[model samples]
Target: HFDAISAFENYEIEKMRDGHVVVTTKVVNSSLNYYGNAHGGYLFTLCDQISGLVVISLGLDGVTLQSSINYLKAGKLDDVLTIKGECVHQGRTTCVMDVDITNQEGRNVCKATFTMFVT
Candidate 1:
């Protein structure tokens, strides 16, 4: 859990907590694809941002080592996407995180994992 639900709205940092976060973003006029769906890039950005926040919480200058994602479902415009980032493993120099993107209905939409190099 993070400081507050709205804390992630603008990528703000309140405190570093050792837990997952429920992130939500709305598809507005500025956020959409030609088909009136949320862009894949937007999802990827959220995943990366979640991983970055988790790694940075460990008090290290963290950098992304690698990332891979699988899109399971499509997100439509006006859909409120909910994402969760969980740290899989935290090592001395690397931290692995798993990110899950879903709609408000709790359907799995995207699955992703990222490794961050902490120094």
Candidate 2:
């Protein structure tokens, strides 16, 4: 139901203080796992999407080298959640960003760091 909604329904681009950007999203069923909880893979997607936007913000294109998420808790099927991404490191060829997937109650449901290789 929610899982298949348009990306526009769950995600947004947030401008940052340093001319950077944050890609964020509210967790919805379309992005949840079979358990009716937020999916770990989708959290990674949120990270990757935002990190890629970081690369774009730097006027470069890139791909992710590595990314992993630590699930902190299970967000229920109808829970409102948001994923926020902020750049932590930016280099000539690589960039790193930290992403936090949190629920409406302010619980961090997932955390991820993404390393991307710019082109």
Candidate 3:
């Protein structure tokens, strides 16, 4: 069976007040790259999916138009990651969100901005 929601089962998602979202997960074996660190693509996917959901929560149909990510620190296996996403700009035609990823130690791991186009 194909399930879009279950596809991201590895992450624990919480919808916060004021159009905010928090996604938390631990890097497991399957989430790592050849170097045994969390893959950049994996992190990006988390940011993208969460950002899309945040936009939809605003009662608007939208799709990702652009995304930019900055990888600051490496996320090692078994390290817990906290991803906080919030709406930055909400317009009639587009919306922007900023996501910050941090490790269990509160160290900055990555930062991303997602742009969604309202349909």
Candidate 4:
């Protein structure tokens, strides 16, 4: 059983221990935009999902309270992207995490910060 969930296909974990995660997924048709490149929303969703997984691996129960993301390079079809997430700060009632996405070329595609409300 997994606490976090993602709908993207070709998902694989490179490393996941405790609160840190390094996973990879491929850009497919569903991840594209009108220009046929990866959509900004899709990229952001990737970061958000990884952040949720980070919380899960951290053994925490919470819901995202706030999220911020920025897109950098565009991802193309069939491109393999790596996503990594970790908790930066764990508080009594809140947790702050960061998630980053990079393409196979090692260029950053997007980055995000998530604040979760602890139960």
Candidate 5:
């Protein structure tokens, strides 16, 4: 079975502006891996969601074609994370997006890059 909405709940949008978005969420048990840190897919999902928002923020529509992520720090249980997304490159038929996640302490947690196709 796939993860339900439980894996994507409690997201709070802190900021949303043109081509940029910032969201906050606290790591719960469901977000964790066997090592007690946030699961990679969980973190990537957050980044991916924000990238979609970033696309919409620009008054456009698109779907992800490819994405890449880098985990810099572990997100522990109860740790609040701020996710930021931006559309970095825009083309007639394609776009590039970047997302960064930071902990409550402002420590860099992870970053992602996405390539999207305009619809």
Candidate 6:
């Protein structure tokens, strides 16, 4: 799970006692858009990946069924981002989680809600 994407960005995983997983990555130019801010798709992918990790931490495997992101602000290049995710509902057939991306200054840049189907 940590092979393909790491070629472009680095990811560090931190597990919390509350069952929340935090993934950290530093933004680079490749992750930015024409406006010189991190791309929305880039942020979404990070949130999605982190959410899946959160699900896996719960001793299950699943694929994202649906996800949505709300961009609050722009994340600039070189800013380190912390993408945190936690499971809100865990069921036999599905799991729901929410994730938020905050820069090093603790300002939220994007947030997302994810629904996954357990397999």
Candidate no. 4 TM-score:
0.91
- Global Cα lDDT for candidate 2: 0.68
Question: Against the hidden true structure, what lDDT does model 4 obtain?
Answer: 0.86
Decoy 1 TM-score against native: 0.80
The whole-model lDDT of each prediction reads 0.70, 0.68, 0.81, 0.86, 0.91, 0.83
What is the per-residue lDDT of model 6 for residues 57-112, given as tens digits with 9 covering 90 to 100?
Answer: 88888988899899998988889999899999888899999999999999989999
User: Which predicted model would earn the best TM-score?
Assistant: 5
RMSD of model 5 against the true structure: 2.0
lDDT of 4 by residue, 29-99 (tens): 87887788788778888888888888888888899989999888888999999999999998999999999
The clash count for each model shown is 0, 3, 0, 0, 0, 0
lDDT of 4 at 12: 94
* TM per prediction: 0.80, 0.76, 0.88, 0.91, 0.93, 0.88
Rate residue 44 of model 5 by lDDT: 95
Q: Model 1: residues >4 Å from true position, as ranges? A: 1-16
Better of 1 and 3 by TM-score: 3
Q: Model 3, range 28-105, lDDT digits (tens) per residue?
A: 776777777788888888777778767767776788888999999998888888888889999888899998889999
TM-score between candidate 3 and the true structure: 0.88
Q: After superposing candidate 2 on the true structure, give the runs of residues whose Cα lies further than 4 Å from its correct spot.
A: 1-9, 16-20
Model 2, 96: alpha-carbon shift in Å?
Answer: 1.3
Give the alpha carbon lDDT tens digit for every residue of 1-119 in model 5. 53432356788998889998999999898898777889999999999999999999999999899999999999999999999998899899999999999999999999999999999
Q: How far out, in Å, is residue 85 in model 2?
A: 1.5
Choose the strongest candidate by lDDT.
Answer: 5
Give the lowest summed-lDDT range of ten residues in model 6.
Answer: 1-10
